[PDB]
Amino acid sequence: AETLDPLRLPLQGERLIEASAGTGKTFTIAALYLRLLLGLGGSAAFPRPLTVEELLVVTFTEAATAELRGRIRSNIHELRIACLRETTDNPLYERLLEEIDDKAQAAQWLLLAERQMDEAAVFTIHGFCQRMLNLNAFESGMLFEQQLIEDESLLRYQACADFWRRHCYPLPREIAQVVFETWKGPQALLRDINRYLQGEAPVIKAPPPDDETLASRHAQIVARIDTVKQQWRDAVGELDALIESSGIDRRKFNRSNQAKWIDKISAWAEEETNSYQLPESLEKFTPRHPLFEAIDQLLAEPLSIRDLVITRALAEIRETVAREKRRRGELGFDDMLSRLDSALRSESGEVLAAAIRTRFPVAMIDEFQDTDPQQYRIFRRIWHHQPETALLLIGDPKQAIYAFRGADIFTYMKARSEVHAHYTLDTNWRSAPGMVNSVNKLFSQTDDAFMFREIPFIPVKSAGKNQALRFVFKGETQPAMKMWLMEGESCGVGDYQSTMAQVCAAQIRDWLQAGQRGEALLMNGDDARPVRASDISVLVRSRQEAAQVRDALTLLEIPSVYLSNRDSVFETLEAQEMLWLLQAVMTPERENTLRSALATSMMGLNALDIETLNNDEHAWDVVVEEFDGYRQIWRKRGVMPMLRALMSARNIAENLLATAGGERRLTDILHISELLQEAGTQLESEHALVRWLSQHILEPDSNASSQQMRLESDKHLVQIVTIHKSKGLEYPLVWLPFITNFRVQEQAFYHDRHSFEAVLDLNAAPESVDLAEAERLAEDLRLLYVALTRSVWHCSLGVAPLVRRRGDKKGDTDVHQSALGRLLQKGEPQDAAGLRTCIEALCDDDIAWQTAQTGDNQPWQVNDVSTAELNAKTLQRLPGDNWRVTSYSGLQPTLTPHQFPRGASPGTFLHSLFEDLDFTQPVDPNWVREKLELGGFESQWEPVLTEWITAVLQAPLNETGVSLSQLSARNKQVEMEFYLPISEPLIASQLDTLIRQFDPLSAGCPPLEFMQVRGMLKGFIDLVFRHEGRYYLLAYKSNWLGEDSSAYTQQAMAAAMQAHRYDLQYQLYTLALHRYLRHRIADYDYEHHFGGVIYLFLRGVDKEHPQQGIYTTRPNAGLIALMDEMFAG
DNA sequence: TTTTTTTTTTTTGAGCGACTGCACTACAACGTTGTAGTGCAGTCGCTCTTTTTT
């Protein structure tokens, strides 16, 4: 490998950057981005400068892409300022300014990059794949709109259940017995094959033939057993082997156990006494007959139906899942990669790759250790060897810890074998040089510490600015790495975990007890800082040991937080308390639910309070009244107003904040309230939200929004964090109590050392088990390097002679089977004294060891402080007056028109029929039939309706007898919308008396009550028309449900006007028409131009009665001026 | 077409592998007897990671 300079890197072809842990990878990416933008490098530069929309940056994590986009924007702005000023304070910016000759063109290009920074092509992998699938949809064959699903486990379980239905149901008893012996149901099969159903389907080594079913394999194994049974029945009754001292004389009893075994071939499990009939075991305890060799050949391979069922499941479930996702039209995260790989797999899609070479002629791929083989196949299809396009794989093989997710280091090894150039970052800017020297000493004990040839380790160099970092104790300067070797010969798992958790808690309380007195310090040069509880962090791997650490730390009065806690908030007691409270609010009549909800910990009442509440009837009546008020608020205002009124009236938030340990409960209550308010807007019914809350209580599924948050941020807590959640973070002091605990992989799923393909071995071959255990040990070594390279000042290790084997004292320990002991014991099996000598061999100034001391003196000291006085400002007046833009409604034989259905929708249909129809032209029956087809009414009503319309049109509506046919198109105006202002507070008592002073219809009609309305009033007049130089108004009322006879005279219409209070509407219409004719027509008189207002009841118009149906009214011409003066001011 | 009423939970780990004790034969020392290796049976620890992508 070679060293990497960001200003001398040739951006041609494929380059492989190996950025170590703690190095400035994001700074090197920003430097290369500025280099690609400005076109710097000279001979090693790009042939042409590129824009922002041509630089493709690929990073997996979305927050990492957002941080990189913000950092690149800040670097662009800083370089633009430094180019406008021709000076800077950074040496890399100084060399960047020294590399360019021109300043004005570079400043203009940086200004255009700052303006085009919003359209930057810095996306994720799946986002880039979705964008390329949606952009060039023709060559790929992708839909334009698709629905991404977050959870795929439901369809996978459905396809597994369908496979178990179509495969395990028609089996006979002799096969279903073996199927039940292999798996209890489809859940066990799904639990077995869930690591192979997702992602790329692996290639099965030595697959069964396509014509072999379960019955053929069962008959083959039955015949194989029956041949051995026949050979035992033929050669029975003889004994010719020599009797040995190990061979007891009870073997004939084992032959009797083999005498009762040959009865039927309905079973599947042979006897263990056949292990006594092996020639390789009898020779070690002279076998000449081939019956023993046939028994050994029968027991050479396990008789199992498991591999054929697993192959049929892997052939069926994935196909059913793909068919279901093609039917529903949905897509997944890996489905975008599979669609892009299938598009590039075709012949025309290669030209599509050239389109990608037309789109972005560069690629900088960050985090190349988390690369699927489909992703690298795509990136090799696009950017293998084409000119003028560059590929920059910036990654780290020592951080590939996501093999459980789908990543694979063999893809990185294939990429390293394919590319030619390698570059590495030498400087480390995070940790102290003592920790750097400890890491370079521990991992360089032997050659190829990661046990693979393509993953080399290089000694990194510490920073010059961080060479004075010292974690000092009361005695002297504490060393960097302190391997706490637990003393003993052999120990178990739980006892070792408990002892190391107690030792870690004792070290935490010793660092915190001496840290609050100014003894233990972090010193940078001469500056010092006391060690708080947030500096010490325990790095664990599993949830059980994290709970063990938390229980061993909370015993010594030390609070600790769990950063890797992914538990749902709906699985706590507070969700059940909120459910009980909502059930008491919804049904407050039954006292049982209210009594069960009042006694919860959210209310916080004693047993004496509950007894006095059951005894006193008046207090329970007050409780029922306030819960009915809460139900009224919940039905009128929603969820969060009811919850806030409940938390303010009961004052339970102050009581939960006063109680120690109730702040997390209060934050959980607030998050449950926020989720209930978020789910309550999408539901109309009130019980539906309660059923949704009970379902989400019964469903412990984890979503990104429904997870538990951090309870507090100001108070420092000991942060327990897993190794996978600590990648890229930073911690001052790190404790690793369970770094020696290891787990042996049992399944045979490995990768070939030549083809680099996933090989799944269904047979229990030892070579596949060893090749899987080698990859497991490499993953454990990578996890060890990740957990080791996160400390800055001090790291502590827990070493112990852990034995995974069940024997207590066997003379050897299994530390060589772990990751730490492979570096301590140099990959050799030793003893506890050998482990101690290997620990004491590598003793430097940075690496020390001490024995594990079990002992506690005192938990802690609280040292609490008082809280200052604080108050809240109060608003003096009301926030606003009653300003609202409202309307009039806000201030308030077989076929006949009498038999018309009375409703709002038929009223609007008749209003639209009278609006759309022309009054001059005769009514056409086909137009009425088309309008009834568009509306959806009956077709039989059409020939009666049109003649009724003509009966309406033949009836004149005027004091002189003017019909509607005499009105031209310019004279009419339909649906005039007006806005009327009013600046005074509209008093109902001052208005109703002014109406009753002039209007004769206000003799009855007691006055309506409304608030003071100041602002605007909307109105929609139906028709305004002029005739012989006089303006007239026309409105339509068509409900008229209660009349079928000719009783709709002027008295009944006046009674309807007094009941529905249309007098105010007609008076406002006259005022609006008067103001309109005053504003429009100059020299306007109200008595000269206005003629009256006509109300047209549609169901009251008769052919013989011209007066019935119409209602003409004229004001007194004195109410209009007073109403205008009142509305004006 | 009308109408009657009711308050009680319960269950749930099992195969893998060692520890220990008894019994039975092989074999050598003193026909009979003591020690060792192996098999069978009851009892008990233990144990089942990590996470994020529009």
PDB file of N, CA, C and O in Angstrom, chain A residues 547-583:
ATOM      1  N   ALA A 547     -27.849  -5.832  30.823  1.00  0.00           N
ATOM      2  CA  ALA A 547     -28.697  -5.802  32.011  1.00  0.00           C
ATOM      3  C   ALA A 547     -27.923  -6.211  33.259  1.00  0.00           C
ATOM      4  O   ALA A 547     -28.177  -5.692  34.351  1.00  0.00           O
ATOM      5  N   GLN A 548     -26.953  -7.115  33.112  1.00  0.00           N
ATOM      6  CA  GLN A 548     -26.103  -7.481  34.241  1.00  0.00           C
ATOM      7  C   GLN A 548     -25.256  -6.300  34.700  1.00  0.00           C
ATOM      8  O   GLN A 548     -25.127  -6.042  35.902  1.00  0.00           O
ATOM      9  N   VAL A 549     -24.686  -5.558  33.748  1.00  0.00           N
ATOM     10  CA  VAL A 549     -23.905  -4.372  34.088  1.00  0.00           C
ATOM     11  C   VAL A 549     -24.789  -3.310  34.728  1.00  0.00           C
ATOM     12  O   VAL A 549     -24.396  -2.665  35.708  1.00  0.00           O
ATOM     13  N   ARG A 550     -26.007  -3.130  34.214  1.00  0.00           N
ATOM     14  CA  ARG A 550     -26.897  -2.120  34.777  1.00  0.00           C
ATOM     15  C   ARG A 550     -27.354  -2.498  36.183  1.00  0.00           C
ATOM     16  O   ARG A 550     -27.484  -1.628  37.051  1.00  0.00           O
ATOM     17  N   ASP A 551     -27.581  -3.789  36.434  1.00  0.00           N
ATOM     18  CA  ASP A 551     -27.976  -4.221  37.771  1.00  0.00           C
ATOM     19  C   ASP A 551     -26.808  -4.159  38.749  1.00  0.00           C
ATOM     20  O   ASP A 551     -26.999  -3.850  39.931  1.00  0.00           O
ATOM     21  N   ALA A 552     -25.590  -4.448  38.281  1.00  0.00           N
ATOM     22  CA  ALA A 552     -24.424  -4.330  39.147  1.00  0.00           C
ATOM     23  C   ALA A 552     -24.014  -2.881  39.379  1.00  0.00           C
ATOM     24  O   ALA A 552     -23.303  -2.603  40.351  1.00  0.00           O
ATOM     25  N   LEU A 553     -24.439  -1.959  38.517  1.00  0.00           N
ATOM     26  CA  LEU A 553     -24.110  -0.552  38.704  1.00  0.00           C
ATOM     27  C   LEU A 553     -25.184   0.212  39.467  1.00  0.00           C
ATOM     28  O   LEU A 553     -24.863   1.182  40.163  1.00  0.00           O
ATOM     29  N   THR A 554     -26.450  -0.199  39.357  1.00  0.00           N
ATOM     30  CA  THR A 554     -27.509   0.452  40.121  1.00  0.00           C
ATOM     31  C   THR A 554     -27.536   0.002  41.576  1.00  0.00           C
ATOM     32  O   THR A 554     -28.241   0.613  42.386  1.00  0.00           O
ATOM     33  N   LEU A 555     -26.789  -1.047  41.924  1.00  0.00           N
ATOM     34  CA  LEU A 555     -26.698  -1.462  43.319  1.00  0.00           C
ATOM     35  C   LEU A 555     -25.820  -0.520  44.132  1.00  0.00           C
ATOM     36  O   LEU A 555     -26.027  -0.369  45.341  1.00  0.00           O
ATOM     37  N   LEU A 556     -24.842   0.123  43.493  1.00  0.00           N
ATOM     38  CA  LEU A 556     -23.948   1.064  44.156  1.00  0.00           C
ATOM     39  C   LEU A 556     -24.402   2.512  43.993  1.00  0.00           C
ATOM     40  O   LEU A 556     -23.571   3.427  44.023  1.00  0.00           O
ATOM     41  N   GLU A 557     -25.707   2.732  43.813  1.00  0.00           N
ATOM     42  CA  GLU A 557     -26.284   4.078  43.742  1.00  0.00           C
ATOM     43  C   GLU A 557     -25.673   4.886  42.599  1.00  0.00           C
ATOM     44  O   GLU A 557     -25.372   6.072  42.743  1.00  0.00           O
ATOM     45  N   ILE A 558     -25.488   4.235  41.456  1.00  0.00           N
ATOM     46  CA  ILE A 558     -24.939   4.884  40.270  1.00  0.00           C
ATOM     47  C   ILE A 558     -25.951   4.745  39.141  1.00  0.00           C
ATOM     48  O   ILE A 558     -26.185   3.630  38.652  1.00  0.00           O
ATOM     49  N   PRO A 559     -26.572   5.835  38.695  1.00  0.00           N
ATOM     50  CA  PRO A 559     -27.516   5.733  37.578  1.00  0.00           C
ATOM     51  C   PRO A 559     -26.790   5.556  36.254  1.00  0.00           C
ATOM     52  O   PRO A 559     -25.718   6.124  36.029  1.00  0.00           O
ATOM     53  N   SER A 560     -27.390   4.758  35.377  1.00  0.00           N
ATOM     54  CA  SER A 560     -26.802   4.431  34.088  1.00  0.00           C
ATOM     55  C   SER A 560     -27.899   4.365  33.037  1.00  0.00           C
ATOM     56  O   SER A 560     -29.026   3.949  33.317  1.00  0.00           O
ATOM     57  N   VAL A 561     -27.556   4.781  31.823  1.00  0.00           N
ATOM     58  CA  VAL A 561     -28.477   4.762  30.696  1.00  0.00           C
ATOM     59  C   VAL A 561     -28.016   3.691  29.715  1.00  0.00           C
ATOM     60  O   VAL A 561     -26.833   3.333  29.656  1.00  0.00           O
ATOM     61  N   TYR A 562     -28.972   3.175  28.948  1.00  0.00           N
ATOM     62  CA  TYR A 562     -28.735   2.165  27.923  1.00  0.00           C
ATOM     63  C   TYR A 562     -29.034   2.793  26.568  1.00  0.00           C
ATOM     64  O   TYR A 562     -30.199   3.033  26.232  1.00  0.00           O
ATOM     65  N   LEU A 563     -27.982   3.056  25.791  1.00  0.00           N
ATOM     66  CA  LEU A 563     -28.160   3.724  24.506  1.00  0.00           C
ATOM     67  C   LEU A 563     -28.737   2.782  23.459  1.00  0.00           C
ATOM     68  O   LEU A 563     -29.406   3.236  22.523  1.00  0.00           O
ATOM     69  N   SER A 564     -28.495   1.481  23.592  1.00  0.00           N
ATOM     70  CA  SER A 564     -28.978   0.500  22.631  1.00  0.00           C
ATOM     71  C   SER A 564     -30.365  -0.028  22.979  1.00  0.00           C
ATOM     72  O   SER A 564     -30.773  -1.065  22.444  1.00  0.00           O
ATOM     73  N   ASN A 565     -31.095   0.658  23.857  1.00  0.00           N
ATOM     74  CA  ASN A 565     -32.432   0.228  24.252  1.00  0.00           C
ATOM     75  C   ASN A 565     -33.416   0.524  23.127  1.00  0.00           C
ATOM     76  O   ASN A 565     -33.745   1.686  22.867  1.00  0.00           O
ATOM     77  N   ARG A 566     -33.887  -0.529  22.459  1.00  0.00           N
ATOM     78  CA  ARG A 566     -34.849  -0.420  21.370  1.00  0.00           C
ATOM     79  C   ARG A 566     -36.245  -0.893  21.768  1.00  0.00           C
ATOM     80  O   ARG A 566     -37.061  -1.193  20.890  1.00  0.00           O
ATOM     81  N   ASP A 567     -36.533  -0.966  23.064  1.00  0.00           N
ATOM     82  CA  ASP A 567     -37.842  -1.424  23.509  1.00  0.00           C
ATOM     83  C   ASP A 567     -38.918  -0.378  23.231  1.00  0.00           C
ATOM     84  O   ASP A 567     -38.670   0.831  23.261  1.00  0.00           O
ATOM     85  N   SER A 568     -40.125  -0.866  22.954  1.00  0.00           N
ATOM     86  CA  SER A 568     -41.253   0.001  22.645  1.00  0.00           C
ATOM     87  C   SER A 568     -41.831   0.642  23.903  1.00  0.00           C
ATOM     88  O   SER A 568     -41.804   0.068  24.994  1.00  0.00           O
ATOM     89  N   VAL A 569     -42.361   1.856  23.731  1.00  0.00           N
ATOM     90  CA  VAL A 569     -43.005   2.564  24.833  1.00  0.00           C
ATOM     91  C   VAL A 569     -44.360   1.947  25.160  1.00  0.00           C
ATOM     92  O   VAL A 569     -44.870   2.106  26.276  1.00  0.00           O
ATOM     93  N   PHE A 570     -44.964   1.235  24.206  1.00  0.00           N
ATOM     94  CA  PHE A 570     -46.267   0.612  24.414  1.00  0.00           C
ATOM     95  C   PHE A 570     -46.200  -0.662  25.245  1.00  0.00           C
ATOM     96  O   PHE A 570     -47.253  -1.220  25.568  1.00  0.00           O
ATOM     97  N   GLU A 571     -45.007  -1.136  25.595  1.00  0.00           N
ATOM     98  CA  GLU A 571     -44.853  -2.357  26.371  1.00  0.00           C
ATOM     99  C   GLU A 571     -44.629  -2.087  27.854  1.00  0.00           C
ATOM    100  O   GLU A 571     -44.370  -3.027  28.613  1.00  0.00           O
ATOM    101  N   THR A 572     -44.723  -0.832  28.284  1.00  0.00           N
ATOM    102  CA  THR A 572     -44.557  -0.468  29.680  1.00  0.00           C
ATOM    103  C   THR A 572     -45.916  -0.424  30.380  1.00  0.00           C
ATOM    104  O   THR A 572     -46.970  -0.626  29.772  1.00  0.00           O
ATOM    105  N   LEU A 573     -45.881  -0.152  31.685  1.00  0.00           N
ATOM    106  CA  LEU A 573     -47.099  -0.030  32.479  1.00  0.00           C
ATOM    107  C   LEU A 573     -47.850   1.269  32.213  1.00  0.00           C
ATOM    108  O   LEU A 573     -49.065   1.326  32.439  1.00  0.00           O
ATOM    109  N   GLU A 574     -47.159   2.308  31.738  1.00  0.00           N
ATOM    110  CA  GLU A 574     -47.818   3.588  31.511  1.00  0.00           C
ATOM    111  C   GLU A 574     -48.814   3.513  30.363  1.00  0.00           C
ATOM    112  O   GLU A 574     -49.838   4.204  30.389  1.00  0.00           O
ATOM    113  N   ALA A 575     -48.556   2.663  29.367  1.00  0.00           N
ATOM    114  CA  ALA A 575     -49.530   2.478  28.297  1.00  0.00           C
ATOM    115  C   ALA A 575     -50.791   1.801  28.814  1.00  0.00           C
ATOM    116  O   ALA A 575     -51.906   2.163  28.419  1.00  0.00           O
ATOM    117  N   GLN A 576     -50.641   0.838  29.726  1.00  0.00           N
ATOM    118  CA  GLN A 576     -51.812   0.201  30.319  1.00  0.00           C
ATOM    119  C   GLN A 576     -52.569   1.166  31.224  1.00  0.00           C
ATOM    120  O   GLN A 576     -53.805   1.137  31.278  1.00  0.00           O
ATOM    121  N   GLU A 577     -51.848   2.047  31.921  1.00  0.00           N
ATOM    122  CA  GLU A 577     -52.517   3.053  32.740  1.00  0.00           C
ATOM    123  C   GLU A 577     -53.274   4.056  31.878  1.00  0.00           C
ATOM    124  O   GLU A 577     -54.392   4.460  32.221  1.00  0.00           O
ATOM    125  N   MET A 578     -52.698   4.448  30.741  1.00  0.00           N
ATOM    126  CA  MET A 578     -53.401   5.344  29.828  1.00  0.00           C
ATOM    127  C   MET A 578     -54.603   4.656  29.193  1.00  0.00           C
ATOM    128  O   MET A 578     -55.638   5.292  28.962  1.00  0.00           O
ATOM    129  N   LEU A 579     -54.497   3.353  28.929  1.00  0.00           N
ATOM    130  CA  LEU A 579     -55.642   2.605  28.421  1.00  0.00           C
ATOM    131  C   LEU A 579     -56.762   2.536  29.452  1.00  0.00           C
ATOM    132  O   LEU A 579     -57.940   2.705  29.112  1.00  0.00           O
ATOM    133  N   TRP A 580     -56.413   2.304  30.719  1.00  0.00           N
ATOM    134  CA  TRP A 580     -57.424   2.295  31.772  1.00  0.00           C
ATOM    135  C   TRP A 580     -58.052   3.674  31.952  1.00  0.00           C
ATOM    136  O   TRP A 580     -59.261   3.786  32.183  1.00  0.00           O
ATOM    137  N   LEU A 581     -57.254   4.735  31.811  1.00  0.00           N
ATOM    138  CA  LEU A 581     -57.797   6.084  31.929  1.00  0.00           C
ATOM    139  C   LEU A 581     -58.738   6.406  30.775  1.00  0.00           C
ATOM    140  O   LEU A 581     -59.789   7.023  30.978  1.00  0.00           O
ATOM    141  N   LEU A 582     -58.387   5.985  29.558  1.00  0.00           N
ATOM    142  CA  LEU A 582     -59.270   6.213  28.421  1.00  0.00           C
ATOM    143  C   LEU A 582     -60.539   5.375  28.514  1.00  0.00           C
ATOM    144  O   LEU A 582     -61.610   5.825  28.090  1.00  0.00           O
ATOM    145  N   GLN A 583     -60.450   4.168  29.080  1.00  0.00           N
ATOM    146  CA  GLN A 583     -61.655   3.370  29.283  1.00  0.00           C
ATOM    147  C   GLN A 583     -62.539   3.952  30.380  1.00  0.00           C
ATOM    148  O   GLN A 583     -63.766   3.813  30.321  1.00  0.00           O
TER     149      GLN A 583
END
